[PDB]
Amino acid sequence: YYLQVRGRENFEILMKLKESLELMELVPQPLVDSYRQQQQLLQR
Amino acid sequence: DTYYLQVRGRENFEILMKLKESLELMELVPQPLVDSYRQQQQLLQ
Amino acid sequence: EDTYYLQVRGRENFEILMKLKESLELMELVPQPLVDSYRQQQQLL
Amino acid sequence: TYYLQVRGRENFEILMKLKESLELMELVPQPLVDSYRQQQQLL
């Protein structure tokens, strides 16, 4: 999908997020699951 | 000053769109209100 | 809206999330007619 | 480690997912991150 955005700072923020969303897909699921388990102790 | 982004994954697109909306809409908020808002947040975290 | 809390590891991460939290909360302050116009433009863009 | 508050359940869920992607991204081996960035340029 393509997205357009006004403002350089906005673009740079969205670019970092796009990257993190796409990169985390490379993380082995057992590590992702362990991470989420840790979240249960940090947030409701 | 517009930029274009490409993203893979419909969920990913949807999240980014929500943030695009908030970042762009925030631009419409008169600066007095942004200032007051930020002052308030200093006691909250 | 109800209040929620999250913890974040990393200053860089914290700063990004704070910027997004700000935008998500501040968009609530934009008068509805301007939100409507914004959405109107986005449909064309 | 920092903490923030946010108003609204949908806002919380959005931030939580971004928090997850930001924090997990750091587990990706650097050579793999470099490979991904190369891919974004070369294609």
Swiss-Prot record, chain B:
Record text about domains: Possesses an acidic transactivation domain, a central DNA binding domain and a C-terminal oligomerization domain that binds to the ABL1 tyrosine kinase SH3 domain.
Cell compartments where the protein resides: Nucleus; Cytoplasm
Disease: Ciliary dyskinesia, primary, 47, and lissencephaly: A form of primary ciliary dyskinesia, a disorder characterized by abnormalities of motile cilia. Respiratory infections leading to chronic inflammation and bronchiectasis are recurrent, due to defects in the respiratory cilia. CILD47 is an autosomal recessive form characterized by onset soon after birth or in early childhood.
Protein purpose: Participates in the apoptotic response to DNA damage. Isoforms containing the transactivation domain are pro-apoptotic, isoforms lacking the domain are anti-apoptotic and block the function of p53 and transactivating p73 isoforms. May be a tumor suppressor protein. Is an activator of FOXJ1 expression. It is an essential factor for the positive regulation of lung ciliated cell differentiation.
Region entry Oligomerization, spans: 1-34
Lineage: Eukaryota, Metazoa, Chordata, Craniata, Vertebrata
Protein's name according to its UniProt entry: Tumor protein p73
Residue span of region Interaction with HIPK2: 1-28
Residues of the full protein shown: 353 to 397 of 636
Gene: TP73
Posttranslational modification: Phosphorylation by PLK1 and PLK3 inhibits the transcription regulator activity and pro-apoptotic function.
Organism: Homo sapiens (Human)
Subunit and partners: Found in a complex with p53/TP53 and CABLES1. The C-terminal oligomerization domain binds to the ABL1 tyrosine kinase SH3 domain. Interacts with HECW2. Isoform Beta interacts homotypically and with p53/TP53, whereas isoform Alpha does not. Isoform Gamma interacts homotypically and with all p73 isoforms. Isoform Delta interacts with isoform Gamma, isoform Alpha, and homotypically. Isoforms Alpha and Beta interact with HIPK2. Isoform Alpha interacts with RANBP9. Isoform Beta interacts with WWOX. Interacts (via SAM domain) with FBXO45 (via B30.2/SPRY domain). (Microbial infection) Interacts with Epstein-Barr virus protein EBNA6; this interaction inhibits TP73-mediated apoptotic pathway.
Domain of life: Eukaryota
Additional facts recorded: Maps to a chromosome region frequently mutated in diverse cell lines of human cancer. Appears not to be frequently mutated in human cancers, in contrast to p53/TP53. Hemizygosity is observed in neuroblastoma and oligodendroglioma. Activated and stabilized by interaction with RANBP9.
Annotated coiled-coil segments of the chain: none
Disulfide pattern: none
Family: Belongs to the p53 family.
Tissues expressing this chain: Expressed in striatal neurons of patients with Huntington disease (at protein level). Brain, kidney, placenta, colon, heart, liver, spleen, skeletal muscle, prostate, thymus and pancreas. Highly expressed in fetal tissue. Expressed in the respiratory epithelium.
Induction of the gene: Not induced by DNA damage. Isoforms lacking the transactivation domain block gene induction.
